[PDB]
Amino acid sequence: AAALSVRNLSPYVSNELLEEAFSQFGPIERAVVIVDDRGRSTGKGIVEFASKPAARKAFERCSEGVFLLTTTPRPVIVEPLEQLDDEDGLPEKLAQKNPMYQKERETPPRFAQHGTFEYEYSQRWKSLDEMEKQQREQVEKNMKDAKDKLESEMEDAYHEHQANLLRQDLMRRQEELRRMEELHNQEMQKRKEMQLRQEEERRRREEEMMIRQREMEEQMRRQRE
Amino acid sequence: AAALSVRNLSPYVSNELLEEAFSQFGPIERAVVIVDDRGRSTGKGIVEFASKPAARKAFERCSEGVFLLTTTPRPVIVEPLEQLDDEDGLPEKLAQKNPMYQKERETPPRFAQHGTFEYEYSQRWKSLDEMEKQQREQVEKNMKDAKDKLESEMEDAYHEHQANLLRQDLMRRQEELRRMEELHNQEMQKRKEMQLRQEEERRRREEEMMIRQREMEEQMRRQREESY
């Protein structure tokens, strides 16, 4: 009653992932992945919500924004579920006999034979339907090939992003080291200068004390005479 | 699977009609016309047989030859039923078995916001998805028009048939009168043959009379001399 078709899932998307993913919009009554007879994923899914406003929010948000379910950036295409009945179908009782139904019953289920424009204009149609089928397949095949070429680019792009993140985190660490090394070079150069300087203050003081001793040795020798 | 997908059905084809039409191949387990919300016929349908060869028979007949069910010449296209699991699907337990399940389920379900590397690549993905819908809707539009340009042309051919059906009658009348002309020309040739015979019958009588008169006179002239 209140369900949506989910398209563009990834083979790794489970029913349990879908249940958990769409719970973000409202309560999930039932969530399933469409899978083939050999157990593999089709790429389609069904999300049955409890009420119509819950499914409305889910459809609207996924149309508006970009809803991702996995690590790989594959956007889930949410569309409303086309409800089609096979339980009751089209009974004869409620099939109105308009001038269009009565007239259509006037010929029984038959096989058209060659020559008659019915046959000739029957296969000629089949031919176009075969062109439609062939054209429909080519589109799907070209877009599958193109999305596969985009996942090959997204592959090389996400690596380059990570490689550049690290190449840049490496260069700040090379610079930090280069700066810590240089600061200490300067810090040791101030200590070198200081030592040589404090050495001369000691060297001069001793020379000054020796000279002033001979100055007081002269002043006393003079004061004798 | 012993069931088939029936398509290109008139909006008037019912479940009961579909059953009666396909019962000629084998036994019918179930025959249904797929209907939409509003209740209209979707043109599609399902036909289930009791045995696999009965379905094989029906598919083979309808793929080769042209099978119809209504007045309007709308052929039935039969394809083997594409069956996919809608109730069990792919559970976590079957999915966990794969190493990639834990790495994909590593980043939780989210809405990728502008600025992220994810958003750029998700827009480039939606861009190809929009390309697909536009290419697919284009393909359907073209064939809807071509299949309509064929249905118009069938109407053109239907009217030209009547134009040749009635023109055939005129050619037949021209041959009916040709025989009546021949019949009359024969019935006059008969009357001519008879006139010349009726005339000869009258003429012979005239001649036979003169011979009968001469013969009597010659006899009478003999009698008078023989008695003299």
Short mmCIF file of C-alpha atoms in Angstrom, two decimals:
data_model
loop_
_atom_site.label_atom_id
_atom_site.label_comp_id
_atom_site.label_asym_id
_atom_site.label_seq_id
_atom_site.Cartn_x
_atom_site.Cartn_y
_atom_site.Cartn_z
CA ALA A 1 0.00 0.00 0.00
CA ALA A 2 2.78 2.48 1.05
CA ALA A 3 5.92 1.14 -0.68
CA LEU A 4 8.83 2.45 -2.82
CA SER A 5 11.12 0.76 -5.35
CA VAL A 6 14.82 1.21 -4.54
CA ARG A 7 17.11 0.96 -7.54
CA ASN A 8 20.85 1.11 -7.87
CA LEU A 9 21.85 -0.93 -4.90
CA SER A 10 25.21 -2.65 -4.77
CA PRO A 11 25.64 -6.38 -4.86
CA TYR A 12 26.73 -6.12 -1.22
CA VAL A 13 23.46 -4.48 -0.08
CA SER A 14 21.40 -6.92 2.12
CA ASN A 15 17.68 -6.80 3.23
CA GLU A 16 19.02 -6.11 6.76
CA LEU A 17 21.05 -3.12 5.41
CA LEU A 18 17.91 -1.74 3.60
CA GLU A 19 15.75 -2.15 6.80
CA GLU A 20 18.40 -0.18 8.77
CA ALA A 21 19.02 2.43 5.97
CA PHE A 22 15.40 3.49 5.32
CA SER A 23 14.46 3.46 9.07
CA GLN A 24 16.01 7.02 8.89
CA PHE A 25 12.73 8.38 7.32
CA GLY A 26 10.08 6.37 9.22
CA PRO A 27 9.01 2.86 10.40
CA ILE A 28 9.87 -0.02 7.99
CA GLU A 29 7.14 -2.68 7.84
CA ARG A 30 9.11 -4.80 5.27
CA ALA A 31 12.39 -4.34 3.27
CA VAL A 32 13.72 -6.75 0.62
CA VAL A 33 16.43 -7.05 -2.06
CA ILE A 34 15.20 -8.49 -5.39
CA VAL A 35 17.40 -11.49 -6.20
CA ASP A 36 17.57 -13.98 -9.04
CA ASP A 37 17.02 -17.83 -8.92
CA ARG A 38 20.84 -18.33 -8.42
CA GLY A 39 20.73 -16.19 -5.20
CA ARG A 40 22.58 -13.11 -6.63
CA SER A 41 21.46 -9.43 -6.30
CA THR A 42 19.45 -7.76 -9.14
CA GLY A 43 20.25 -4.15 -8.12
CA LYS A 44 16.57 -3.40 -7.33
CA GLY A 45 14.77 -3.41 -3.95
CA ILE A 46 11.43 -2.89 -2.16
CA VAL A 47 10.87 -0.78 1.01
CA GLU A 48 7.37 -1.19 2.48
CA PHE A 49 6.64 1.48 5.13
CA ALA A 50 3.75 1.50 7.65
CA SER A 51 2.09 4.78 6.42
CA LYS A 52 2.10 6.95 3.21
CA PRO A 53 3.67 10.10 4.90
CA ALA A 54 6.68 7.91 6.01
CA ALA A 55 7.25 6.80 2.35
CA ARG A 56 6.60 10.41 1.17
CA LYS A 57 9.50 11.75 3.34
CA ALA A 58 11.74 8.89 2.06
CA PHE A 59 10.91 9.51 -1.62
CA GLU A 60 11.15 13.36 -1.39
CA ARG A 61 14.48 13.42 0.56
CA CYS A 62 16.19 10.89 -1.78
CA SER A 63 15.06 12.90 -4.85
CA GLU A 64 16.21 16.19 -3.19
CA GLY A 65 19.48 14.95 -1.59
CA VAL A 66 22.01 12.13 -2.17
CA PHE A 67 21.31 8.96 -0.12
CA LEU A 68 24.27 6.58 0.21
CA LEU A 69 24.06 3.14 1.91
CA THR A 70 27.70 1.94 1.68
CA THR A 71 31.36 3.14 1.75
CA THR A 72 31.30 3.39 -2.10
CA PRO A 73 29.47 6.62 -3.19
CA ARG A 74 26.59 4.89 -5.10
CA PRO A 75 23.39 7.04 -4.85
CA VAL A 76 20.25 5.00 -4.15
CA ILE A 77 17.54 5.87 -6.75
CA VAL A 78 14.25 5.87 -4.82
CA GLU A 79 11.01 5.84 -6.90
CA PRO A 80 7.37 5.13 -5.82
CA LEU A 81 6.31 1.46 -6.21
CA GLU A 82 4.03 0.83 -9.22
CA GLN A 83 1.32 -1.36 -7.75
CA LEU A 84 0.06 -3.95 -10.22
CA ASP A 85 -2.56 -6.63 -9.40
CA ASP A 86 -2.32 -10.33 -10.48
CA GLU A 87 -4.49 -11.77 -7.60
CA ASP A 88 -7.84 -10.66 -9.21
CA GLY A 89 -6.82 -9.39 -12.69
CA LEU A 90 -9.45 -8.47 -15.33
CA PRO A 91 -12.58 -10.69 -14.91
CA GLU A 92 -15.21 -11.02 -17.71
CA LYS A 93 -17.96 -9.71 -15.32
CA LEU A 94 -16.42 -6.21 -14.85
CA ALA A 95 -15.20 -6.06 -18.46
CA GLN A 96 -17.67 -3.56 -19.91
CA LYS A 97 -19.29 -4.48 -23.23
CA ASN A 98 -19.06 -1.06 -24.86
CA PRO A 99 -19.25 -0.77 -28.66
CA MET A 100 -15.56 -1.53 -28.19
CA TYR A 101 -15.86 -4.76 -26.18
CA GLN A 102 -18.84 -6.34 -28.08
CA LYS A 103 -17.10 -5.69 -31.46
CA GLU A 104 -13.78 -7.19 -30.19
CA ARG A 105 -15.56 -10.44 -29.12
CA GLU A 106 -16.96 -10.78 -32.73
CA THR A 107 -13.70 -12.64 -33.75
CA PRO A 108 -12.30 -15.62 -31.75
CA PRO A 109 -8.68 -16.47 -30.65
CA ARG A 110 -7.11 -17.47 -33.96
CA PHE A 111 -3.82 -17.86 -35.84
CA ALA A 112 -3.57 -15.48 -38.85
CA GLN A 113 -2.48 -17.05 -42.13
CA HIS A 114 -0.20 -15.71 -44.89
CA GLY A 115 -1.49 -13.22 -47.49
CA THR A 116 -4.12 -11.67 -45.17
CA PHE A 117 -3.12 -8.10 -44.17
CA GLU A 118 -3.70 -9.28 -40.51
CA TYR A 119 -0.67 -11.55 -40.67
CA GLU A 120 1.37 -9.34 -42.91
CA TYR A 121 0.59 -6.50 -40.57
CA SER A 122 1.22 -8.73 -37.60
CA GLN A 123 4.85 -9.73 -38.10
CA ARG A 124 5.68 -6.28 -39.36
CA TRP A 125 4.78 -5.09 -35.88
CA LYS A 126 6.72 -7.95 -34.15
CA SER A 127 9.75 -6.73 -36.20
CA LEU A 128 9.44 -3.21 -34.58
CA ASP A 129 8.92 -4.77 -31.12
CA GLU A 130 12.18 -6.76 -31.73
CA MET A 131 13.89 -3.42 -32.60
CA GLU A 132 12.53 -1.88 -29.30
CA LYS A 133 13.87 -4.87 -27.26
CA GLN A 134 17.29 -4.58 -29.08
CA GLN A 135 17.41 -0.79 -28.57
CA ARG A 136 16.37 -1.13 -24.84
CA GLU A 137 19.23 -3.67 -24.27
CA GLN A 138 21.82 -1.45 -25.96
CA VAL A 139 20.98 1.52 -23.76
CA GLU A 140 21.32 -0.62 -20.54
CA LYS A 141 24.53 -2.16 -21.92
CA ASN A 142 26.05 1.27 -22.82
CA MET A 143 25.10 2.80 -19.41
CA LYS A 144 26.41 -0.28 -17.49
CA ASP A 145 29.71 0.06 -19.46
CA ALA A 146 29.76 3.84 -18.66
CA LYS A 147 29.03 3.42 -14.89
CA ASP A 148 31.79 0.74 -14.83
CA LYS A 149 34.16 3.32 -16.49
CA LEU A 150 33.12 5.86 -13.74
CA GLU A 151 33.85 3.33 -10.90
CA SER A 152 37.34 2.87 -12.59
CA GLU A 153 37.89 6.70 -12.44
CA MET A 154 36.45 6.99 -8.85
CA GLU A 155 38.99 4.16 -8.02
CA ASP A 156 42.06 6.16 -9.30
CA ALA A 157 40.63 9.42 -7.87
CA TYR A 158 40.10 8.14 -4.29
CA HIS A 159 43.66 6.71 -4.30
CA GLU A 160 45.20 10.03 -5.52
CA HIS A 161 43.24 11.90 -2.82
CA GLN A 162 44.62 9.56 -0.05
CA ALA A 163 48.17 9.57 -1.60
CA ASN A 164 48.07 13.40 -1.69
CA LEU A 165 46.69 13.58 1.93
CA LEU A 166 49.76 11.56 3.09
CA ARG A 167 52.30 13.29 0.75
CA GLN A 168 51.11 16.58 2.36
CA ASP A 169 51.13 15.23 5.98
CA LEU A 170 54.68 14.03 5.22
CA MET A 171 55.92 17.49 4.04
CA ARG A 172 54.62 19.28 7.19
CA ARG A 173 56.60 16.66 9.24
CA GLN A 174 59.68 17.27 7.05
CA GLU A 175 59.28 21.05 7.64
CA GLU A 176 58.58 20.66 11.43
CA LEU A 177 61.90 18.69 11.67
CA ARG A 178 63.75 21.29 9.46
CA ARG A 179 62.45 24.06 11.81
CA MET A 180 63.27 22.16 15.08
CA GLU A 181 66.81 21.47 13.70
CA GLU A 182 67.36 25.15 12.67
CA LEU A 183 66.07 26.56 15.99
CA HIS A 184 68.63 24.33 17.84
CA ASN A 185 71.35 25.41 15.37
CA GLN A 186 70.61 29.09 16.39
CA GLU A 187 70.24 28.09 20.11
CA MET A 188 73.70 26.37 20.02
CA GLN A 189 75.17 29.37 18.13
CA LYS A 190 74.07 31.78 20.92
CA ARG A 191 75.64 29.33 23.50
CA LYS A 192 78.90 29.18 21.42
CA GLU A 193 79.18 33.04 21.23
CA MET A 194 78.27 33.35 24.99
CA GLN A 195 81.03 30.86 26.03
CA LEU A 196 83.77 32.57 23.89
CA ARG A 197 82.55 35.97 25.31
CA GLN A 198 82.41 34.88 29.02
CA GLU A 199 85.93 33.41 28.33
CA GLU A 200 87.25 36.85 27.27
CA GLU A 201 85.59 38.56 30.28
CA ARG A 202 87.54 36.07 32.50
CA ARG A 203 90.76 36.42 30.37
CA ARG A 204 90.66 40.28 30.50
CA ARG A 205 89.75 40.42 34.26
CA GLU A 206 92.81 38.25 35.16
CA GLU A 207 95.03 40.48 32.92
CA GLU A 208 93.45 43.59 34.56
CA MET A 209 94.06 42.19 38.10
CA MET A 210 97.75 41.44 37.24
CA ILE A 211 98.36 44.94 35.76
CA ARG A 212 96.63 46.73 38.75
CA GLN A 213 98.87 44.69 41.14
CA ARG A 214 102.03 46.14 39.44
CA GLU A 215 100.29 49.61 39.58
CA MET A 216 99.92 49.27 43.42
CA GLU A 217 103.48 47.78 43.52
CA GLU A 218 104.74 50.96 41.78
CA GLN A 219 102.70 53.36 44.01
CA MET A 220 104.23 51.75 47.16
CA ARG A 221 107.87 51.75 45.81
CA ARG A 222 107.49 55.49 44.95
CA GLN A 223 106.04 56.27 48.46
CA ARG A 224 109.24 54.77 50.02
CA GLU A 225 111.52 57.50 48.49
CA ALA B 1 9.10 -22.71 -14.35
CA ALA B 2 6.21 -23.77 -16.68
CA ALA B 3 4.63 -20.24 -16.84
CA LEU B 4 4.70 -17.54 -19.56
CA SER B 5 4.62 -13.71 -19.90
CA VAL B 6 1.90 -12.60 -22.33
CA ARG B 7 2.18 -9.05 -23.74
CA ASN B 8 0.60 -6.67 -26.39
CA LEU B 9 -2.95 -7.58 -25.20
CA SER B 10 -5.99 -5.37 -26.05
CA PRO B 11 -7.45 -3.47 -22.98
CA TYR B 12 -10.55 -5.68 -23.52
CA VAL B 13 -8.76 -9.11 -23.17
CA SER B 14 -10.11 -10.74 -19.95
CA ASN B 15 -8.63 -13.52 -17.68
CA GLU B 16 -11.35 -15.98 -18.86
CA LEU B 17 -10.57 -15.16 -22.55
CA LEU B 18 -6.78 -15.56 -21.99
CA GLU B 19 -7.49 -19.01 -20.41
CA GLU B 20 -9.74 -20.14 -23.34
CA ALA B 21 -7.12 -18.89 -25.88
CA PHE B 22 -4.12 -20.70 -24.32
CA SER B 23 -5.99 -23.92 -23.26
CA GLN B 24 -5.53 -25.10 -26.91
CA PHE B 25 -1.80 -25.69 -26.14
CA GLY B 26 -2.03 -27.49 -22.78
CA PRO B 27 -3.76 -27.56 -19.35
CA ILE B 28 -4.22 -24.16 -17.64
CA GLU B 29 -3.21 -23.94 -13.98
CA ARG B 30 -3.62 -20.10 -13.86
CA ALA B 31 -4.27 -17.36 -16.48
CA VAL B 32 -4.30 -13.69 -15.48
CA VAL B 33 -4.40 -10.18 -17.05
CA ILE B 34 -2.17 -7.81 -14.98
CA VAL B 35 -4.19 -4.73 -13.93
CA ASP B 36 -3.18 -1.32 -12.50
CA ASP B 37 -4.38 0.62 -9.44
CA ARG B 38 -7.16 2.39 -11.31
CA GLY B 39 -8.20 -1.00 -12.80
CA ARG B 40 -7.18 -0.69 -16.49
CA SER B 41 -5.48 -3.58 -18.38
CA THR B 42 -1.66 -3.13 -18.34
CA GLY B 43 -1.36 -5.01 -21.66
CA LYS B 44 0.73 -7.65 -19.82
CA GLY B 45 -0.39 -11.03 -18.43
CA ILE B 46 0.60 -14.42 -16.94
CA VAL B 47 -0.26 -17.93 -18.24
CA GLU B 48 0.71 -20.97 -16.05
CA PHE B 49 0.60 -24.55 -17.45
CA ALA B 50 0.44 -27.93 -15.60
CA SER B 51 3.44 -29.34 -17.56
CA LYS B 52 6.72 -27.80 -18.87
CA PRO B 53 6.18 -29.08 -22.53
CA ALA B 54 2.69 -27.41 -22.67
CA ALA B 55 4.37 -24.00 -22.02
CA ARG B 56 7.18 -24.88 -24.50
CA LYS B 57 4.50 -25.66 -27.18
CA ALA B 58 2.67 -22.29 -26.66
CA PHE B 59 5.92 -20.24 -26.69
CA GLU B 60 7.11 -21.99 -29.91
CA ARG B 61 3.77 -21.51 -31.77
CA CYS B 62 3.48 -17.78 -30.85
CA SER B 63 7.15 -16.85 -31.51
CA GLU B 64 7.01 -18.36 -35.03
CA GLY B 65 3.39 -17.62 -36.05
CA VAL B 66 0.97 -14.73 -35.38
CA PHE B 67 -1.51 -15.43 -32.53
CA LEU B 68 -4.52 -13.10 -32.03
CA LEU B 69 -7.50 -13.07 -29.57
CA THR B 70 -9.66 -10.04 -30.64
CA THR B 71 -11.17 -8.45 -33.82
CA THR B 72 -8.33 -5.88 -34.14
CA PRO B 73 -5.10 -7.54 -35.47
CA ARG B 74 -2.96 -7.12 -32.29
CA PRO B 75 -0.41 -10.02 -32.04
CA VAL B 76 0.35 -11.73 -28.71
CA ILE B 77 4.06 -11.66 -27.74
CA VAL B 78 5.10 -14.60 -25.59
CA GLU B 79 8.31 -14.60 -23.52
CA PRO B 80 9.56 -17.05 -20.83
CA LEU B 81 8.56 -15.65 -17.38
CA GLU B 82 11.40 -13.71 -15.66
CA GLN B 83 11.21 -15.09 -12.09
CA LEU B 84 13.01 -13.27 -9.22
CA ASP B 85 12.81 -13.74 -5.39
CA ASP B 86 10.64 -11.00 -3.82
CA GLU B 87 10.08 -12.59 -0.37
CA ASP B 88 13.45 -14.00 0.81
CA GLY B 89 16.08 -11.99 -1.12
CA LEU B 90 19.67 -11.45 0.11
CA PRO B 91 19.90 -11.68 3.98
CA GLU B 92 22.84 -10.40 6.10
CA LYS B 93 23.90 -14.04 6.88
CA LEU B 94 24.24 -14.91 3.19
CA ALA B 95 25.89 -11.49 2.57
CA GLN B 96 28.41 -11.57 5.53
CA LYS B 97 30.09 -14.62 3.82
CA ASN B 98 31.68 -12.06 1.42
CA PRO B 99 34.76 -10.06 2.67
CA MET B 100 33.43 -6.90 0.93
CA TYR B 101 30.24 -6.86 3.09
CA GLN B 102 32.08 -5.60 6.23
CA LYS B 103 34.06 -2.96 4.23
CA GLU B 104 30.92 -1.65 2.52
CA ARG B 105 28.92 -1.71 5.82
CA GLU B 106 31.94 0.21 7.33
CA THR B 107 30.42 3.65 6.42
CA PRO B 108 26.80 3.96 7.69
CA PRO B 109 23.73 5.08 5.60
CA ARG B 110 24.02 8.83 5.18
CA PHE B 111 23.28 11.90 3.07
CA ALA B 112 26.55 13.07 1.40
CA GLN B 113 26.75 16.87 1.77
CA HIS B 114 28.34 19.44 -0.59
CA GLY B 115 32.13 19.76 -0.28
CA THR B 116 32.78 16.01 0.10
CA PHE B 117 34.52 13.86 -2.57
CA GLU B 118 31.45 11.58 -2.19
CA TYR B 119 28.98 14.33 -3.30
CA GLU B 120 30.95 15.12 -6.51
CA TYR B 121 31.05 11.43 -7.52
CA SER B 122 27.41 10.84 -6.52
CA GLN B 123 26.39 13.76 -8.75
CA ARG B 124 28.49 12.26 -11.64
CA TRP B 125 26.59 9.02 -11.02
CA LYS B 126 23.10 10.70 -10.98
CA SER B 127 24.23 12.46 -14.25
CA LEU B 128 24.57 9.06 -16.05
CA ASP B 129 21.34 7.84 -14.37
CA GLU B 130 19.54 10.90 -15.82
CA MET B 131 21.20 10.02 -19.19
CA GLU B 132 19.76 6.47 -18.94
CA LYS B 133 16.18 7.66 -18.32
CA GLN B 134 16.39 10.16 -21.16
CA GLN B 135 17.88 7.52 -23.55
CA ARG B 136 15.24 4.91 -22.48
CA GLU B 137 12.31 7.27 -22.65
CA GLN B 138 13.59 8.34 -26.07
CA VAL B 139 13.70 4.66 -27.29
CA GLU B 140 10.09 4.05 -26.05
CA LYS B 141 8.86 7.33 -27.66
CA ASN B 142 10.32 6.41 -31.09
CA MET B 143 8.82 2.87 -31.09
CA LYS B 144 5.43 4.16 -29.71
CA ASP B 145 5.37 6.47 -32.78
CA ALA B 146 6.64 3.80 -35.30
CA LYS B 147 4.14 1.22 -33.92
CA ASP B 148 1.49 3.97 -34.29
CA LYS B 149 2.66 4.85 -37.88
CA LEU B 150 2.17 1.06 -38.58
CA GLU B 151 -1.39 0.96 -37.06
CA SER B 152 -2.37 3.94 -39.24
CA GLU B 153 -0.94 2.20 -42.32
CA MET B 154 -2.93 -0.99 -41.58
CA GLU B 155 -6.10 1.24 -41.77
CA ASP B 156 -4.81 2.59 -45.13
CA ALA B 157 -4.35 -1.04 -46.33
CA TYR B 158 -7.81 -2.03 -44.96
CA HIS B 159 -9.50 0.71 -47.03
CA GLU B 160 -7.48 0.00 -50.24
CA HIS B 161 -8.61 -3.67 -49.89
CA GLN B 162 -12.30 -2.55 -50.02
CA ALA B 163 -11.27 -0.31 -52.99
CA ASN B 164 -9.96 -3.51 -54.70
CA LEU B 165 -12.75 -5.77 -53.31
CA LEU B 166 -15.42 -3.62 -55.05
CA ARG B 167 -13.18 -3.01 -58.15
CA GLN B 168 -12.97 -6.86 -58.39
CA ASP B 169 -16.83 -7.00 -58.63
CA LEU B 170 -16.84 -4.56 -61.60
CA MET B 171 -14.28 -6.80 -63.44
CA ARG B 172 -16.60 -9.82 -62.74
CA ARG B 173 -19.71 -7.95 -64.08
CA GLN B 174 -17.72 -7.10 -67.28
CA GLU B 175 -17.23 -10.94 -67.56
CA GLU B 176 -20.94 -11.79 -66.63
CA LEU B 177 -22.16 -9.52 -69.50
CA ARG B 178 -19.39 -11.06 -71.73
CA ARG B 179 -21.03 -14.43 -71.18
CA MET B 180 -24.57 -13.11 -71.58
CA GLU B 181 -23.33 -11.53 -74.87
CA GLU B 182 -21.82 -14.93 -75.87
CA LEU B 183 -25.04 -16.83 -74.71
CA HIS B 184 -27.28 -14.50 -76.77
CA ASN B 185 -24.89 -14.59 -79.82
CA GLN B 186 -25.08 -18.39 -79.47
CA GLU B 187 -28.94 -18.40 -79.12
CA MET B 188 -29.23 -16.29 -82.34
CA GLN B 189 -26.76 -18.55 -84.29
CA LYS B 190 -29.16 -21.39 -83.26
CA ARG B 191 -32.20 -19.42 -84.58
CA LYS B 192 -30.31 -18.74 -87.88
CA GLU B 193 -29.55 -22.53 -88.27
CA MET B 194 -33.29 -23.18 -87.72
CA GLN B 195 -34.64 -20.55 -90.10
CA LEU B 196 -32.58 -22.02 -93.04
CA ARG B 197 -33.90 -25.52 -92.13
CA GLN B 198 -37.56 -24.35 -91.85
CA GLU B 199 -37.16 -22.61 -95.25
CA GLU B 200 -35.65 -25.82 -96.81
CA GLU B 201 -38.56 -27.89 -95.33
CA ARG B 202 -41.06 -25.44 -97.00
CA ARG B 203 -39.05 -25.44 -100.22
CA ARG B 204 -38.84 -29.24 -100.37
CA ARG B 205 -42.66 -29.47 -99.98
CA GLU B 206 -43.06 -26.97 -102.90
CA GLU B 207 -40.67 -29.13 -105.08
CA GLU B 208 -42.19 -32.51 -103.98
CA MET B 209 -45.63 -31.12 -104.93
CA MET B 210 -44.51 -30.37 -108.55
CA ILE B 211 -42.98 -33.89 -108.85
CA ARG B 212 -46.30 -35.36 -107.47
CA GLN B 213 -48.31 -33.27 -110.06
CA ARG B 214 -46.05 -34.12 -113.08
CA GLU B 215 -46.14 -37.83 -112.01
CA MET B 216 -49.98 -37.75 -111.86
CA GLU B 217 -50.37 -35.86 -115.21
CA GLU B 218 -47.82 -38.17 -116.98
CA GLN B 219 -49.80 -41.16 -115.55
CA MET B 220 -53.22 -39.73 -116.66
CA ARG B 221 -51.89 -39.05 -120.21
CA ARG B 222 -50.72 -42.73 -120.25
CA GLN B 223 -54.16 -44.05 -119.12
CA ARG B 224 -56.08 -42.18 -121.89
CA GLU B 225 -53.72 -43.57 -124.64
CA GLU B 226 -53.76 -47.18 -123.25
CA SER B 227 -57.63 -47.10 -123.17
CA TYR B 228 -57.73 -45.52 -126.73
#
